[PDB]
Design a protein around this nucleic acid. Structure first.
Ligand SMILES: Nc1nc2c(ncn2[C@H]2C[C@H](O)[C@@H](COP(=O)(O)NP(=O)(O)OP(=O)(O)O)O2)c(=O)[nH]1
Ligand SMILES: [Mg+2]
Ligand code: NA
Ligand code: NA
Ligand code: NA
Length: 314
DNA sequence: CCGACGTCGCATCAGC
DNA sequence: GCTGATGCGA
DNA sequence: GTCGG
């Protein structure tokens, strides 16, 4: 069904990027995902329509695609200069639907036009521009291992009591990642209580961290690069998490996004709620955080077969 | 018919 | 100067 | 755009 899901993803992008209709963006994604998992070749819109997330308007477009191998709206929007320029610019990290509109309105449409107009870009955007190609390359696990080796080593160096845990697709054992996600704790930061700055500073000292998109007391977002053809520049996030909310942190930032969604809806059916900090019991009556001393406890609570990070794709 | 559609930390903007 | 709203990327 | 109160 690849043709149909490429069509739907491309509509979703225009809804988000150009139309600024986030809810139609999500509805097309929701339908692209349920169509992706469906083990038959779709022969009719009405057959699609059986699936949850596929309604009458997507059914119509499936039929037009089946009968013609395209949609008239999509062909038109691609041949539209304004729209397709707005869509493209949002590929720069730090340029969203709003900024891209503003650039395009004032004649700024390509990376070329962005490279000529630095004065009109915020700091995040300049970094996104500067690393445009690099931020779209993937990261083989062998480099993620090398990035990790470095991260754990410098972290332990600053203070032996830190615990650093690489999460995201890495922890799930993916053969390649889009980026590095790192979680951080320390005995002297819990909910009852420079810890991130010091780590970031050390990783800048040894030339691992090359730029900074944003930085606060608990969330850093930035760029790194392995030491030396020189490696691509890579996205890295580091979050400082309360030691006593550690396991909820690791679950959430281990993901995937789609597994967390799943686990959060199941947590509804069994009368609990889960964010990155806590699991709390719910008549909608979300009370106090529960004790947690393993990822498993969180599965124990909502009665779910514990799952290996390995198996948290869906 | 019409409201819901996750939540979060940080940077930047609007407005007093 | 400050607070609160919004943009952005998860 | 899809769903469901
Ligand atoms: N609430 C929320 N959480 C998210 C979202 N996206 C991701 N997460 C959570 C779930 C993720 O597990 C975690 C890391 O975010 P990523 O680095 O963008 N995704 P990953 O590491 O899994 O894949 P790769 O890096 O290979 O692209 O953050 C989101 O949109 N919303
Ligand atoms: Mg990641
Ligand atoms: Na349906
Ligand atoms: Na962007
Ligand atoms: Na990430």
């Amino acid at each position: 069904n690849g043709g149909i899901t490429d069509m739907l993803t491309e509509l979703a992008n225009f809804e988000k990027n150009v139309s600024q209709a986030i809810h139609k963006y999500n509805a097309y994604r929701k339908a692209a995902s349920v169509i992706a998992k469906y083990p038959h070749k779709i022969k009719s819109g009405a057959e699609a329509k059986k699936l949850p997330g596929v309604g009458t308007k997507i059914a119509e477009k499936i039929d037009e695609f089946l009968a013609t191998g395209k949609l008239r709206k999509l062909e038109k929007i691609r041949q539209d200069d304004t729209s397709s320029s707005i869509n493209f610019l949002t590929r720069v990290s730090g340029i969203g639907p709003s900024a891209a509109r503003k650039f395009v309105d004032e004649g700024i449409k390509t990376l070329e036009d962005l490279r000529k107009n630095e004065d009109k870009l915020n700091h995040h955007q300049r970094i996104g521009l500067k690393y445009f190609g690099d931020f779209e390359k993937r990261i083989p696990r062998e480099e993620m291992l090398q990035m990790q080796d470095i991260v754990l080593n410098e972290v332990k160096k600053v203070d032996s009591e830190y615990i650093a845990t690489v999460c995201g697709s890495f922890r799930r054992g993916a053969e390649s990642s889009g980026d590095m996600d790192v979680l951080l704790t320390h005995p002297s930061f819990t909910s009852e209580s420079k810890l991130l700055h010091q780590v970031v500073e050390q990783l800048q000292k040894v030339h691992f961290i090359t730029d900074t998109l944003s930085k606060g007391e608990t969330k850093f977002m930035g760029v790194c690069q392995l030491p030396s053809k020189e490696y691509p520049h890579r996205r890295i996030d580091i979050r400082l998490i309360p030691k006593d909310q550690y396991y909820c942190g690791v679950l959430y930032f281990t993901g995937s996004d789609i597994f967390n969604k799943n686990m959060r809806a199941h947590a509804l059916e069994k009368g609990f709620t889960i964010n990155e900090y806590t699991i709390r019991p719910l008549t909608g009556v979300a009370g106090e955080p529960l004790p947690v001393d393993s990822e498993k406890d969180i599965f124990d609570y909502i009665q779910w077969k514990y799952r290996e990070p390995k198996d948290r794709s869906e």
